[PDB]
Amino acid sequence: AELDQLLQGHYIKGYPKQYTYFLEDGKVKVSRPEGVKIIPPQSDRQKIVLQAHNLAHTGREATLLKIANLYWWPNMRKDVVKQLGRCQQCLITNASNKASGPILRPDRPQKPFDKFFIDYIGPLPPSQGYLYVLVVVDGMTGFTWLYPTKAPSTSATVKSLNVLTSIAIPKVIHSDQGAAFTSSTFAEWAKERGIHLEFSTPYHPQSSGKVERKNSDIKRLLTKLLVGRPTKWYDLLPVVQLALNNTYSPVLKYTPHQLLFGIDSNTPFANQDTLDLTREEELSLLQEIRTSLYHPSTPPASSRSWSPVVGQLVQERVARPASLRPRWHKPSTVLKVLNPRTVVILDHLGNNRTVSIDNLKPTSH
Amino acid sequence: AELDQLLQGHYIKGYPKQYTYFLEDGKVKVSRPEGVKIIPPQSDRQKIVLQAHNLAHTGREATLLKIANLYWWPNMRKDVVKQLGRCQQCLITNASNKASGPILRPDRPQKPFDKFFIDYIGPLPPSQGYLYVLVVVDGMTGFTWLYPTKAPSTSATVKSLNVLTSIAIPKVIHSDQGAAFTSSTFAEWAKERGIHLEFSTPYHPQSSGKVERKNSDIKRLLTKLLVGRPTKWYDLLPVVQLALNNTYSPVLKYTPHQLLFGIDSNTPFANQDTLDLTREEELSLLQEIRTSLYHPSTPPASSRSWSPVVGQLVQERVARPASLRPRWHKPSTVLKVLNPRTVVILDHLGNNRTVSIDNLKPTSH
Amino acid sequence: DRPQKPFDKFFIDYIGPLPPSQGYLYVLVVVDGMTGFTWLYPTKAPSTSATVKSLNVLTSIAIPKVIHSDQGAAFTSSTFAEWAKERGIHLEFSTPYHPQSSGKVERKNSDIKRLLTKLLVGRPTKWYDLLPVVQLALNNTYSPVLKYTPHQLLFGIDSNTPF
Amino acid sequence: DRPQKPFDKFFIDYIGPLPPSQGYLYVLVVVDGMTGFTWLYPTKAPSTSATVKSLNVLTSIAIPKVIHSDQGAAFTSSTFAEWAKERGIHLEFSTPYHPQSSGKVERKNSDIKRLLTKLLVGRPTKWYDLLPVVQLALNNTYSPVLKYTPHQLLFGIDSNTPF
DNA sequence: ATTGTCATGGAATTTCGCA
DNA sequence: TGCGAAATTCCATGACA
DNA sequence: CACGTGCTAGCACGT
DNA sequence: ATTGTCATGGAATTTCGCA
DNA sequence: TGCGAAATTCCATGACA
DNA sequence: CACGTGCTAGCACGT
Ligand SMILES: [Zn+2]
Ligand SMILES: [Zn+2]
Secondary structure (H helix, E strand, O other): OOOOHHOOOOOOOOOOOOOOEEEEEEEEEEEEOOEOOOOEEOHHHHHHHHHHHHHOHHHHHHHHHHHOEEOOOOOOHHHHHHHHHHHHHHHHHOOOOOOOOOOOOOOOOOOOOOEEEEEEEOOOHHHHHEEEEEEEEEEEOOOOOOOOEOOOHHHHHHHHHHHOOOOOOOOOOOOOOOOOOOOHHHHHHHHOOOEEEEEOOOHHHHHHHHHHHHHHHHHHHHHHOOOOOOOOOOOHHHHHHHHOOOOOOOOOOOOOHHHHOOOOOOOOOOEEEEEEEOOOHHHHHHHHHHHHOOOOOOOOOOOOOOOOOOOOEEEEEOOOOOOOOOOEEEEEEEEEEEOEEEEEOOOOOOOOOEEEHEEEEOOOO | OOOOOOOOOOOOOOOOOOOOOOOOOOOEEEOOOOEEEEEEEEEEHHHHHHHOOOOOOHHHHHHHHHHHEEEEEHHHHHHHHHHHOOOHHHHHHHOOOOOOOOOOOOOOOOOOOOOOEEEEEEOOEEOOOEEEEEEEEEEOOOOOOEEEOOOOOOHHHHHHHHHHHOOOOOOOOEEEOOOOOHHHHHHHHHHHOEEEEOOOOOOOOOHHHHHHHHHHHHHHHHHHHHOOOOOOOHHHHHHHHHHHHHEEEEOOOOOOHHHHHOOOOOOOOOOOOOOOOHHHHHHHHHHHHOOOOOOOOOOOOOOOOOOOOHHHHHHHEEEOOOOOOOOOOOOOOEEEEEEOOOEEOOOOOOOOEEHHHHEEOOOHH | OOOOOOOOEEEEEOOOOOOOOOOEEEEEEEEOOOOOOOOEEEEEEOOHHHHHHHHHHHOOOOOEEEEEEEEOHHHHHHHHHHHHHHHOEEEEEEEOOOOOOOOOHHHHHHHHHHHHOOOOOOOOOHHHHHHHHHHHHHOOOOOOOOOOOHHHHHOOOOOOOOO | OOOOOOOEEEEEEOOOOOOOOOOEEEEEEEEEEEEEEEEEEEOOOOHHHHHHHHHHHHOOOOOEEEEEEEOHHHHHHHHHHHHHHHHOEEEEOOOOOOOOHHHHHHHHHHHHHHHHHOOOOOOOOOOOOHHHHHHHHHHHOOOOOOOHHHHHHOOOOOHHHHO
8 A cells, every 4th residue: 555645635647536545444445437446556466467367367358357346446458468468378378369461472483494393292092002292383384293202202302303304404493391302312412403492481381382282283183083983093193294284274374384385285175376486486475475474463461460570579380289288389589571471580499490470470468 | 067058158146257167178167366266066066075174174264275276166165164064073073162151140048058059179188087078058158067078978978967957957958960969868868858959060160169169268278277287187177167157258248157147156356246236136137138248240241152042053061081082072952941051951872961051062053 | 234145155064874875875965045056966975075076066166155064074174174265265154053044044954855855765775866856846946935946046047947 | 388396296216225224225215306305215125115104204294296206116016006196196207227307306316326425435334324414415405507405495495504 | 591372163344246 | 336245354262281 | 219391190989 | 950159459449537 | 628548349360170 | 890970190201
């Protein structure tokens, strides 16, 4: 009872005056429209907000109502929120009510072999004792190569990619941080050939979206063809590879084969509208097409989005949380804002990490 | 070459006239802005749309472009779409581009014990050799009872529910079609006590939303309390049950305990604003609160939603599709439209089934 | 003082021994002071240990301000003392040999004590299994004094199982 | 006729036997008629069975209108006949003993045949492992006749690995 | 150090055949 | 020209992880 | 050998 | 024969203290 | 009355299956 | 014993 001059009519900032503050049972009380509540000293208040909150680690409004059941003080929610900010369990357990920043729509690779996009589909039904598939999608064209493997290992990855790069060598190759892509052994092979390795932020397949989205088309057509018949898929990849590379994307009105070559091969329903033009007048028109291709823009930001600012406190989704364990790591600081969807954090272990904002929540308070 | 009178200037409906239709290589051709395309006879057309489509079972526009590479005929897309309609593989493999009807917001049970909502949380970390929890949520109030079990079996379910119904007997009890709730043994017990069993449509937990949404709060607070400490959760359910039943929902400004009793028990921060009123003046005010409680309404329907009409052809999401198998069962007919989100279908096996439109897509064409 | 409310006082007491129905020799009895609402717990002994185990179930639902009982061993332990305080329930006892609750409770502790015995040598060593039904009628018995039943008084609604 | 285009004719031929590098004794050679783009496939025998296996890889990328070859056994089977038709490739052969492709191909089948031999007794029985690099230079070799390289002609872009 | 993507099929919109 | 029909395009939905 | 990243398995219940 | 739900914390909105 | 500050309420986001 | 409904396990790779 230190700022107690209220009984003596003294005006202390933040305390409305029209209310009479009496004493009773050794507690300063105040008759409010709510009822009569007890005003605890500024020293006790933290201990009470803590006591109340820890009942079910209730959020702001929930924690307040409990408190209001008995007490009144100036600007209750401020003392409340201050604690929610210092509660390690709620901070790391409570989900976020902010959604991510709107997606980037990376510009699409300028020419063939500019960026490759690679992945590993499977395991799948053992067909010819092969369990996996290495998908290789050219960024610019969407041309796709499908290599059956027995394991998602550096071995087969290099083994396929060598065969693939007997055709051409690509500037950069993008992929998830999957076991065999992060391998030093692969890092070698990559560097031997002066190929730049790019890696998607961890636990964020959107970033290997081009492969992944082809992963659908592959898996979908593979399915349509194994209807009412065993899942022997090995002997169908080539069929699928051709079928798919030669399948028109309605937005662009071009097949991935077309954007790579400019001219249809000896495939069915083969298009011959450039049969007149000499190969130069053909190839020329191609660089004209490859430039004016449709490109989607960033969609509108959610009304309740959030954007990574340097130094802001954020937390990283726990990769594989156990049963009944928090889903958020302790809070970390933003070092670099690579872009509105990518962030270098001071990882909890305690490293530098490049993460998608999709695996972050901003720390509340 | 049957409707061939075009070379002889005759006008056949659907064929623009400004174009000259010549012959060449035994195929009727037509010079178009596109180039020169071959007009196949009305008999051949299906065989060609089929040939083209089956290349990668491409959808409407994708399948057409292939076709347009060589041919022209009146209203190509019509012959195209007709086949997509008769292709059993695409019909059952292609995902849907219509989203469901907007959700219902069922009116909330009029009084306590009107509808119970029950579920089985777990398996979980063996604590005291108990692996599961039976959650029982009163609909009207949200009062919750938590019974630890060793199995999600009729045994423990009845065993708990007997204890629970020593307090009161509920009119109806709702639950997912989980093993132990569909049991005849449970059906008995239920009927013995003149309790009506209700069951959520299959593979649709939104329908047991009240339990499920309490399933969060339970699991979340259980987690906040096992931070940096073993996952022994048995000895914490009671604690959680009290803590939760007595935790204010900010929308309603009431604890589930309050809506059940009208008066706080001997729990911390206990609210005493009805200490003046006699129990009648208390109980009376309660029926007044329980009526004016907030209730959410149906949100806007998506611009591309779809609504179950009787007799319309729809398909049921394959419960657990295998690897590389179609996700849609063959198409079935709507018999009863229970409501804009619930449908009796002629199940594929071939039964009557009550399904959520959330596990249906309308059959395209 | 201020008006009688539910949870204000839980009057407790044992009843036993009884015939070993399924292995349960006693019955811990809890009645609400204001609604007369009654909770019945078959226990194997009228001990604090078996009593705590039971009022631990009850107190996960509601908590009374005061538990009022007789001076029977079970209720006057140090254990039961410490248990009460940890939960903020005030303990209160009748003065020994000359018991005292209220009219409502006095009658209910009777209602139960008789409602039990019809089930005694009317239904052999099979009373455990019907203990919940005893409870249900008990809580749906129309009160002359107060115009209402306990289930109506406590919950504020008609019950779906009235007697 | 109409202008020469890629995929119009794939000229094929074998080269072997060679030293057993890793177990591969021959090399199936495919050249594009128009771009001069060249595909190299180490095979253990110049057989239809090993040839099909290789042109099955190639034809999952592109398909030529015409495969043109010599009358070597491998290329004139019934098997290779039936294989060609199933895919819609027209088969075409040089008249035996007096071979004939085009200037572009004639030179490339040389380029390869010499580009191979520097790697023969210049790099012992270790040529299999470098077969892909042979291919790469081969496809990045500036053409005097046409101002461009095969990789530029086929894909329409500068290559990232030019020679 | 990095970044979502595109086949899909009713609905809307723009173009075409013929005056 | 302007109209009605046909062809095109738009696009949100869902699946790939 | 456990950890990280990438993936899909699998088990319980009652009929 | 059935039907989504609600704690959450910045942002918006409405109410309060004092003239 | 009207103003500035404080308290309330709104609400889309995400997690429960 | 396989099927249906409800659930969460688990394994591969390279370091
Ligand atoms: Zn907390
Ligand atoms: Zn199809």
